[PDB]
From Swiss-Prot, chains A, B:
CDD domains: PKCI_related. Disulfide bonds: none annotated. Signal peptide: none annotated. The modification Phosphoserine is found at residues 34, 61. AMP binds at residues 32-33, 88, 94-96, 101-103. Its main location: cytoplasm. It is found in: Cytoplasm; Nucleus. This is Adenosine 5'-monophosphoramidase HINT1. It comes from Oryctolagus cuniculus.
Amino acid sequence: RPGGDTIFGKIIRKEIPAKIIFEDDQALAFHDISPQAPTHFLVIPKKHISQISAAEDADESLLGHLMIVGKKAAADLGLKKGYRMVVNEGSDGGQSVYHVHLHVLGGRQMNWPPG
Amino acid sequence: RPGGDTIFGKIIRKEIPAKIIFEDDQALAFHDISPQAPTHFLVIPKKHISQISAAEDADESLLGHLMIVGKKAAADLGLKKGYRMVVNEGSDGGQSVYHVHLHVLGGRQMNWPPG
């Protein structure tokens, strides 16, 4: 199915709404349901890539596009003092939903280590 | 100067060594000096992009290439249970060195929030 078979596939197909902040032909950005910072949103590809370890070389431009969308949406939301981008891979990374998703977090100082 | 004028430019030009684990015509990966996980390395572009908010649309493929290099190097290092990728932008993101760098952390459960 276009958009894949996870929670995110229903968002991509518009079956279930989300707090959408950016949309193009490649990607969607929307506010995260469990925010960990004053701004916390996800950027996802419309194409169903399960996890970053399943991305192929021909996906490079799309993966970079997720970062450029994250930069643009962070600017629209008025981040001026920066943000952190996070991609979780597999169990140790903390990934639960097996569709690639880039987190963008800002509006506070982000700490270290990053989890 | 090729590789730019930060700490990372001296690594790219091989003026100062680093624990290099992957190298191609676009990018370099090397172990981080201040590791926060049993595996913690950086992937950097050879081209000097100061920060993710300064990346241009034509940089998408290179930005995605940093993620594919991170996937490949994480596999070479034997991560099997996953990892987390992190890009810090500006002061709130925790960026100190103004040359794009992707962290890849694994070999332990990564926590939440990610800082």
